[PDB]
Write a protein that binds this DNA or RNA. Sequence first.
RNA 1: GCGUACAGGGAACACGCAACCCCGAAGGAUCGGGGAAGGGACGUCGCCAGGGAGGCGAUUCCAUCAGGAUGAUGACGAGGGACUGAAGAGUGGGCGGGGUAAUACCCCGCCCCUUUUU
Lengths: 55, 55, 55, 55
Amino acid sequence: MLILTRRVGETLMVGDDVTVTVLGVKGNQVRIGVNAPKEVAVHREEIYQRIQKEK
Amino acid sequence: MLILTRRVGETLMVGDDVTVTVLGVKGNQVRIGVNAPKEVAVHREEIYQRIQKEK
Amino acid sequence: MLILTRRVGETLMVGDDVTVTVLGVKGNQVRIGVNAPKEVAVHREEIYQRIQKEK
Amino acid sequence: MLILTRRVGETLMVGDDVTVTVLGVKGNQVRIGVNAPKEVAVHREEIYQRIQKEK
RNA sequence: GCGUACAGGGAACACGCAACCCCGAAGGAUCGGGGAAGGGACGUCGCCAGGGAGGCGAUUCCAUCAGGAUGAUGACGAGGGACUGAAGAGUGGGCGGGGUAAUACCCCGCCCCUUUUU
């Protein structure tokens, strides 16, 4: 429900040092790196969490 | 600490109530947003966390 | 003498290593660029080249 | 940030180095000719970076 | 997003119109301003109806591997010193050769133009 249209990098910052940042882009592919801390669970919403649900 | 290379249309939700994905690309600009609930506070840069730091 | 080469964009001449690439397109001309220093002097199509050949 | 754009009919640079010309145009692909001093180290991004990593 | 054609001193913007936001005003008359950034929009871009609807196409390098690392691998051609090269397709303009009572039309070779293979 949101849209912000960043340019270089602006954090996420819900209060747990999770920060979105655009690193690189060419063509139609965006290097988007997130320096979230290690205690939170990061994942790709794909076949990974699909087989996590289908464990 | 940075995991990246998500193509247009793909999603990268970390496994919680985040729902982060790319919303298209206008060349050198990015379209990015979430449908995270308003209980957690997602914001842009220091231009919108200086209100969070009261400065 | 007149060495020729090929690009789809993002050219390179070693030795300079800072600004060798203006290789974009919008139909007729060059478009892409990020940064360039003042230590690499430039001259357009005889523009200021004539005045530096004069005085 | 000192990004230029000139005519694709012909091109030149400052006088201490004899420099690039322009020959072809095909979409994003482009033929580049340079009237360069052969002796000066000139290379593209193919193998020379790897052999400099070797050296 | 649509565009436009630049201007030179070194500038991802140069301008217009859309797009966006906010304000005011007279209740057959719908008018005018201001800006360039905000937020909790399950988005942007196109269409279909009875006795006051519910619907349909929709992400565009088919790359290809994954993982706590300002990740990687690639993308027709490597040396280069060349108005480079190798191909493929098509357009017509042509030049010839064969077919063709003849004309018209069919096939083959070469030059130029557009497009495809980082």
